[PDB]
Point group: D2
Chain length 296, copies 4
């Protein structure tokens, strides 16, 4: 019908934006990363989201990235472009620009920082949803944006034809479960810590940060859960848990770029105010990656 | 030690029925305990928070425990709530429960006074040391104002009597790892997270909504454990309105009002807990009809 | 007609309950401490509050301590008895028993742990207020009790003739300022960190933990503020800040008992689940005490 | 460096007026700036959060700054908001503000992206290095999702250009000590805490309700400064309803609706911010009457 799993994917990486030594956009590496992540078992990628350092890249860079990633993997994976900011006008421009590039879908985070009221969020999300014909995910992350999309807002927004699901970092699994049951909105785990809980509650899949490093295992986790092998699912979730722990220490940006580098896929360093892992951080990260069998 | 056999898989955090005058009603407690077991609970927690442990005396708790043991103790596991924010008292209580023949203990993190982790460890250890009963830690920082930090849980794990955790902290990721590392059994201590906890390998539920929907929770546990997650998810959705009602009322007000709606009068809460208002009963009745446990 | 400052005091210690070596109630030491604290500048004391280890003492012990304290200082200081638990009927017995002993007022904390609704709190505080003729203070401390006394509940309760004030640890200075203006409820700073901001907002004084160690400076701080010398008040508040920092590390019970010992006033150790300071914690506290000029 | 003289004692976190079509309205900005200075503000912050920094372009912010400098720069201190969650952008914006002749910078903690403390420090250092302007840190974790931790503020205090903090974090105890240790100036960034901040030695207010009640906030600062705390307390009570309306509406909706109610139309917010509904206007009007800033 709208087949969210087919149209958006089941395992997506909230993909980093590789930068060169010169700190500029590195689209060739983005292509290589995108290919690698899909080969490792991702069937979708979110480009220019939070972990893609959307705050510090320009509109132009976001479009160049999306173009490169679509060229690299667009015929065999779903490419979802991060398109929202705390500026409704800007989000609509970016959304239209992403659609014009051929993005397969949009991920639109709750306007952050400015704490609009729920009716402002709701007018914001529908305006963005009205801007293109692309399927759109809400990204509910009050821990970064400083306001939740309240359940009544999510429910009101669900009736928008273009708004098809929720990337959740709010962790209200009880509320999201009901929302799903009532509205048919698809949910993606937006927090690797809750990947397995979310699947139990009927999430469609993951939009994952630790997928940068452990996509193969996450794919296996999805396959095991999917075939009702919960014991295995649980065991894989435990196996990757050190990466999620490392993520708590470093955040996704620092972790993803340092961890990829450790795996021999240099994707450069974060842009200020984000920072590259320190020596000791790289150390501790390497031990977790070893523990999760994603580094020798 | 078989946690599922010894403690159960579906337990109600059972109310303590009071008479019209406010006094302990053990006859109704027996009748309730029988009902809850017949509906599908294989264990009960008596004199926990939902059992209004704050407002009942030691004597009342013991009276109730004996009544419930006598009623269902041959056919279900009866775990007694035994800790407060007072180690000496908790010890006394745990001992009094063991002397009555309680099958296990549920020991909440000391509330209010916010001891440091080493105080918590010394406290749980002292309680664990006081009887030979299996003991669950009850981690509910939202009530107690301090968590049992994962290191503290792990240190406690190696106490022979400390066999698991009733979790209301919702740190599913951390609980999962603790389980994997220590073999501590986890019980969902918050109905909202029943299904997520099962996914993470919880042993079962120590439930409030079980007062009203034990049969469905049992079906949820069986569907889940048989490998039928889609049916488990459906059942979870079916009972959600009860968890919603619980967010509005709290477990004590909900459980007493809902049982009354079901025709099992268990009296009213003791101050500072309060009986549902007429409006609340009506809204509660709507959720209960929605959950197919009334009318 | 009720003069809160005269009836309840301006500088109170949330006084520890001294225990002997065997853990038993030490009333002779309580009497010595009560005298010391009054001599140092407190004009009132709260007995059997949280810092007095109300969770771990019996009713009998509370009554015995109250008597010892009234006897020691009740002729020249106000003696306020902690009477609230999460059990209304118990709080009533306690309140009555304290009234019968001659307590000058009651401090009644929000029922903890069980999270009654606001109407439950209202019925609870009312029932306790109805139990005796004593003036009564609400102790709003959601950080321990797990529920606030909401402003509407406080306002409702202000309408009781026996409820005369609030010991605040909620830090809603804006709300408390308005409550005071609207209701004439007196406020006492219940968290030493906010003593000075609370005075700015019209608090009557402090019900203090660090007063165990620094009553004289707190007295000076009240006097400086009262005479409008805010610069001096701010200076003193800075001088005693290390004690407030130590309190963050140790909690009040541990800090008060270890600190008094350091000062040559041994008041024994806390009862489990509270714990005595470790030698390291004692060293760190001594450094803070010296900085605050309340230890050689 | 005289912070009071160089940055002011009473500043409004000023709205950015938009025309009917949503476009920047610099004439009304100039109008508004003159009005606020005349009412008692001795500085203004332009293109802060209340100034809708999220929804205005760089060009608009510069145009507005230029107009506000022309309007009141000779008689008031005009502080330009210059921080975002992008360090290179913040640097551009700071430079651009300095080139316009801004008297100082207000730089908010990078929001949303939750950089670590060392990222914050490198960020605020890079922005502080970018111009010769005095700079205020704006610590508001309730919006930015990370605090500037005390150690970070203390490390930053040593930067010659970093001269103070606009606080919305409400850690009065910590700011008090930071002030004592570093000489950093503090401004109350949350009207609720204006009076408590003065007690702790804040230099003044960077205020939202100053849009409506600058004159009373001025009377407050003066009463406090001369040692008449009783009067300061009374004034703070008198304007409290404005702070309460702010809790209902947020500063942007409140400021633009309230100014309109006063007869200074500054248009409507840009999405995702929203204009007050009719009921909200009524309820706001009632508070403004209570605060004697509306007939
Ligand atoms: Cl939700
Ligand atoms: Cl944990
Ligand atoms: Cl309040
Ligand atoms: Cl701070
Ligand atoms: Mg839809
Ligand atoms: Mg064990
Ligand atoms: Mg009164
Ligand atoms: Mg400096």
């Amino acid at each position: 019908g709208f087949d969210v799993a087919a149209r958006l994917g089941t395992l997506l990486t909230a993909m980093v934006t590789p930068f060169s030594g010169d700190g500029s956009l590195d689209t060739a590496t983005a292509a290589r990363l995108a290919n690698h992540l899909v080969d490792q078992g991702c069937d979708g990628l979110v480009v220019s989201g939070t972990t893609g350092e959307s705050p510090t890249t320009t509109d132009g860079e976001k479009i160049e990235l999306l173009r490169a990633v679509l060229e690299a993997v667009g015929d065999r994976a779903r490419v979802i472009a991060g398109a929202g900011t705390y500026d409704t006008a800007h989000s609509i421009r970016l959304a239209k620009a992403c659609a014009a590039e051929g993005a397969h879908g949009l991920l639109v985070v709750t306007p952050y920082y400015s704490k609009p009221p729920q009716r402002g969020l709701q007018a914001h999300f529908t305006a963005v949803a009205d801007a293109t014909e692309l399927p759109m995910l809400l990204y509910d992350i009050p821990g970064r944006s400083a306001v939740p999309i309240e359940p009544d807002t999510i429910r009101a927004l669900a009736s928008h034809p273009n708004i098809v699901g929720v990337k959740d970092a709010k962790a209200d699994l009880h509320s999201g479960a009901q929302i799903m049951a009532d509205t048919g909105l698809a949910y993606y785990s937006g927090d690797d810590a809750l990947n397995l809980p979310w699947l139990a509650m009927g999430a469609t899949g993951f939009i994952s940060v630790i997928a940068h490093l452990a996509a193969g295992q996450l794919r296996e986790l999805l396959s095991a859960f999917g075939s009702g092998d919960i014991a295995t699912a649980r065991k894989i979730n435990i196996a990757v848990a050190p990466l999620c722990n490392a993520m708590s220490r470093l955040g996704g940006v620092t972790l993803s770029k340092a961890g990829l580098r450790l795996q021999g896929i240099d994707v450069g360093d974060p842009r200020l105010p984000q920072v590259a892992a320190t020596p000791e951080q790289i150390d501790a990260l390497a031990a977790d990656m070893r523990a999760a069998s994603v580094l020798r």
